[PDB]
Amino acid sequence: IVGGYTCQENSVPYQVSLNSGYHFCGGSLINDQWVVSAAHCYKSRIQVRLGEHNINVLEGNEQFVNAAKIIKHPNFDRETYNNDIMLIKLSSPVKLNARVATVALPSSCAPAGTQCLISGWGNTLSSGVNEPDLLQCLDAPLLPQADCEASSSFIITDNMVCVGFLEGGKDACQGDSGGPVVCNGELQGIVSWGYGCALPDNPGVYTKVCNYVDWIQDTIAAN
C-alpha cells in the first residue's frame, strides 16, 4: 500500500497473508475454512497466515494453516486478469476470535463514491520496492468506470472496478494482490492489477466481487 497508514493492531481481522516461504499475496477469510484471493496468486502449495500484524515477528495471535484446495476461477484470463478470483479451502477450520474474523460477501454492487478500506503488506513505494513489516491500511473511494479510463493507460472489463485517487500518491501495489477492499463491512473488491503504483491518472484495478457471489457459494457448497 503506497501512501497509507499502519493499521491498528488486528483491526482488519479478516486479512490473511499467503505465504510460500515468504509473503507473496493477501486474501480475505470469508468463513472458518475458506479464503478468497486473486487467481493470479495461485501456487501449488500455500500456507495461509491469520491473525497477523507484523509478518516478521511472532506476536502470539497467529494461526498458520495449510491450503487444502486451491481453486481458480475457471475463466481466469492471465492476459487481461479478467475473472481474477480464487478460493482456498483450508486444511482445517480456524479458531475465530477477536483477531481472526470473517468478512461478509456483498449483498449488492457498491455505488461509485462509496468509501472503502484496502489493506496489505505490499510495496509501499511508487518507485522502487519496500516491503513493510506491519499491515498497512488505505481509505479510498470506488470510482466511476468512466473517470478511471479518462486519462489512464488502460481499460477495464465489467468484472473490474477502479478504487483510488486520480491525482495519485495513494494506491495498492505489488504484494497487496489478492487482498481486500471492504466497504461498509462487505468485501467489494480484490486487489488485482494496475499501471505502476500510485501514479496520477492511473487508479488501481480490482476484481468486482459482487459479480461472483453465486460462483463463490456454489464452489464452497460443492467442495
Q: Is 54 annotated as belonging to a binding site?
A: yes
C-alpha cell at 141: 473511494
Q: Taking the complex as a whole, how short is the minimal distance between the CB of residue 22 and Ca ion, in angstroms? A: 13
Q: Taking the complex as a whole, how short is the minimal distance between the CB of residue 51 and Ca ion, in angstroms? A: 8
CA 154 to chain centre: 20
Q: Taking the complex as a whole, how short is the minimal distance between the CB of residue 65 and Ca ion, in angstroms? A: 14
Cβ closest to Ca ion, residue 54 vs residue 174: 54
Cβ closest to Ca ion, residue 52 vs residue 171: 52
Q: Is 52 annotated as belonging to a binding site?
A: yes
Pure H helices in the chain: 145-149, 213-222
Cβ closest to Ca ion, residue 40 vs residue 99: 99
Contact (Cβ atoms closer than 8 angstroms) between residue 169 and residue 3: yes
84 is an active site residue:
yes
Q: Is 186 annotated as belonging to a binding site?
A: no
Q: Taking the complex as a whole, how short is the minimal distance between the CB of residue 85 and Ca ion, in angstroms? A: 27
Catalytic residue among 17, 28, 84, 119: 84
Cβ closest to Ca ion, residue 6 vs residue 54: 54
Q: Is 163 annotated as belonging to a binding site?
A: no
DSSP sequence for 58-71: --S--EEEEEEEEE
Alpha carbons 131 and 121: distance in angstroms, whole number: 7
Contacting positions for Ca ion (CB under 5 A): 52, 54, 59
Q: Cα dihedral angle (149, 119, 41, 223), rounded to 10 degrees?
A: -110
C-alpha cell at 142: 470506488
- Residue in 102, 82, 84 with CA at minimum distance from that of residue 93: 102
List binding-site positions for Ca(2+): 52, 54, 57, 62
